[PDB]
């Protein structure tokens, strides 16, 4: 009944609907999208459901909506470095993170859950993915939507990683547990990691970190090449 994580974002229904309306306004090729149907499918995935019993099947009525064009070679994957990834695509408008697609744009920076017996949106608390349960509305949404975006990637797949982290590449992150395993070797030639020196000055070649060599090994067994670049100065990287 009570959960360890923050509750549903305030005015979540209006936010999801406005975002859909705004996204289909900016992208005229998407004006065929019924935003009422989008909100109804999103709402239907988690309302009246126990927020630790959520499955990929619950999101399929939403997953089918929002078809759009994202060139396979213009995908940008990221892990634990959300701000820099989104600033990059705001500059290089041809490239997309998942949160630049309709489904990702709807849910970016939001939290949501319901209660089993009632039609109420639980605004008090929502399950913490590490403390309460992994099969919660927010975690299941991202894991389900991400897999298809990773399956789409081709040629050189770029991933931005946070080099200031204890684990630059985390095997148990959405990228590490979902996206990496859905990259298709028949279509993907190389996975290129961009290790961001976000925080403190670190003159080290972070492309030699054990977690990077671990990522190289996982991607190698799936018959894909690996490339790594250090982004020593991220603030100057955006201007370049």
């Amino acid at each position, epitope marked *: 009944q009570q959960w360890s994580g923050p509750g549903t974002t305030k005015r979540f229904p209006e936010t999801v609907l406005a975002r859909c309306v705004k996204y289909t306004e900016i992208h005229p*090729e998407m004006r065929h999208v019924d935003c009422q149907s989008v909100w109804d499918a999103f709402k239907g995935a988690f309302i009246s459901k126990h927020p630790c019993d959520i499955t990929e099947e619950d999101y*399929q*009525p939403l997953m089918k909506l929002g*078809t759009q064009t994202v060139p396979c070679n213009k995908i940008l994957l990221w892990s634990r470095i959300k701000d820099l990834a989104h600033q990059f695509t705001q500059v290089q408008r041809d490239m997309f993170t998942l949160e630049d697609t309709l489904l990702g744009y709807l849910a970016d920076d939001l939290t949501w859950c319901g209660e089993f017996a009632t039609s109420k949106i639980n605004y008090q608390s929502c399950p913490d993915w590490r403390k309460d349960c992994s099969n919660n509305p927010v975690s299941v949404f991202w894991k389900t939507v991400s897999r*298809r975006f990773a*399956e789409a990637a081709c040629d050189v797949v770029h991933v931005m990683l946070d080099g200031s982290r204890s684990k630059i590449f985390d095997k148990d992150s959405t990228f590490g547990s979902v996206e990496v395993h859905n990259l298709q070797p028949e279509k993907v030639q190389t996975l290129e990691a961009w290790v961001i020196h976000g925080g403190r000055e670190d003159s080290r070649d972070l492309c030699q970190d054990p977690t990077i060599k671990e990522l190289e090994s996982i991607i190698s067994k799936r018959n894909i090449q690996f490339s790594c670049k250090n982004i020593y100065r991220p603030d100057k990287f955006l201007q370049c």
Partner: antibody
Amino acid sequence: QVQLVQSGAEVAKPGTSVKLSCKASGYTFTDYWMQWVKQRPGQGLEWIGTIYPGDGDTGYAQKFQGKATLTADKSSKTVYMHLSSLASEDSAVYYCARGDYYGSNSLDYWGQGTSVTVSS
Amino acid sequence: DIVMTQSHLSMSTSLGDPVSITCKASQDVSTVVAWYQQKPGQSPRRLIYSASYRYIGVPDRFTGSGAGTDFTFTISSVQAEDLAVYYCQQHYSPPYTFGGGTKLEIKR
């Protein structure tokens, strides 16, 4: 490697039914619309309808509503198209094709087609 | 249903020359039009989609343009392997209707 493998050629008497199959491999079956296209001998392509296997939602062009029924078997990663009350005009090659979700549902991978011949 | 009209059923060309095929939609389909190539006894193959997008590996001699109700597919330099039937399709709103096809044959 994405592949769509369709069932073999069918021959049917008028008024009977036929169920065609399309087995998908190399991608997450539930996450893409599967669409079907008819091609009468020597004629052009005609869009029949579609199914989203993740939730079973379907839709058909007016011409084929009441003629075609699409279903999906998630365990076998197979989409089926059932054609009822067969007539000579139903003789054609039927293709299944995947809608590219990040290609605005254009048809990226195609099956090899199933020939259906309806005759007495 | 939206009607897609390819006004030329057949076009004669020469190897190395450019060819353009036109398609007209009965209603606005924004930029969401695809072009498929089909050879005898083969399944159709997507060449262009969303009016002008081309999947990695599809030859750059194939281009698409257009928006609204008028679309064009061009082969900048016809190769022997390009003699086939070309179909436009709108993939904007279901039913995702096809044009009637245009067969490209060689002049002699």
